[PDB]
Amino acid sequence: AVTWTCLNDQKNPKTNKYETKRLLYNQNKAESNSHHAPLSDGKTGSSYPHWFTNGYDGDGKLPKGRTPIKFGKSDCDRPPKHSKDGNGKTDHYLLEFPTFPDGHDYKFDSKKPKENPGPARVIYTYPNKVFCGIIAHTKENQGELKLCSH
């Protein structure tokens, strides 16, 4: 359906240089992976799906240098009322699952061991899970998560 593509900088060990590769993700897989994982902030093996601060602190306000990934939604931009385990009575926090391009459902339940996650991640509310988009770290898997574009 939709093709969420991101541009992450990979430090190729062969060339010891940073290259900007195009990480194409299939929304169908993101909206699917997210429709497989349980809706609970840090309550699984790999912890995932973990609450996505989205720049927020866990209430609605943002720390020093407010940079909340703007998806273009009112609920995705809404204050993510993240509780203890982000699982109250009707918690509406923005979760961030590590979505894969292959379209597999990474073992997010596998605590130990637990292979390294992915750069591009799926973002979606709860329990609505109104798939907002995919975001990836323009610098490998750490740099500011730039909302991929389809």
Side-chain angles (χ1 to χ4, degrees):
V2 174
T3 266
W4 292 77
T5 314
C6 252
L7 291 144
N8 286 207
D9 204 21
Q10 276 174 26
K11 181 212 62 171
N12 216 5
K14 175 111 157 165
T15 58
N16 225 269
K17 177 172 255 155
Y18 257 130
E19 326 191 310
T20 307
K21 319 235 80 260
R22 299 139 182 181
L23 241 70
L24 152 277
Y25 282 73
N26 222 101
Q27 167 179 357
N28 171 23
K29 267 50 132 176
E31 70 100 88
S32 167
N33 246 6
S34 51
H35 289 185
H36 235 241
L39 278 159
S40 43
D41 156 65
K43 223 165 164 284
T44 331
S46 83
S47 91
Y48 305 136
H50 80 117
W51 159 63
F52 188 33
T53 62
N54 184 252
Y56 309 107
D57 247 290
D59 216 345
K61 277 85 184 171
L62 298 104
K64 179 93 242 182
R66 312 205 241 181
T67 194
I69 289 181
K70 192 208 256 209
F71 301 90
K73 261 267 163 74
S74 247
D75 287 320
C76 285
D77 178 57
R78 256 236 218 164
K81 221 105 243 289
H82 163 279
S83 187
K84 253 267 179 113
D85 274 89
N87 64 338
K89 61 115 174 200
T90 192
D91 189 327
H92 64 98
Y93 70 104
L94 256 192
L95 335 81
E96 168 140 85
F97 187 101
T99 190
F100 286 68
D102 255 19
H104 68 252
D105 28 45
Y106 162 69
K107 58 235 259 173
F108 63 84
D109 165 73
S110 219
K111 203 194 162 180
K112 53 171 284 284
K114 178 221 152 208
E115 184 182 286
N116 216 46
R121 305 218 204 79
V122 62
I123 313 304
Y124 54 95
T125 75
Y126 151 83
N128 248 301
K129 282 184 124 145
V130 177
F131 166 91
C132 244
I134 287 102
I135 63 160
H137 312 246
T138 44
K139 195 281 299 237
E140 274 234 319
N141 75 334
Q142 217 145 254
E144 267 95 85
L145 287 127
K146 195 190 167 203
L147 170 78
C148 309
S149 62
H150 68 91

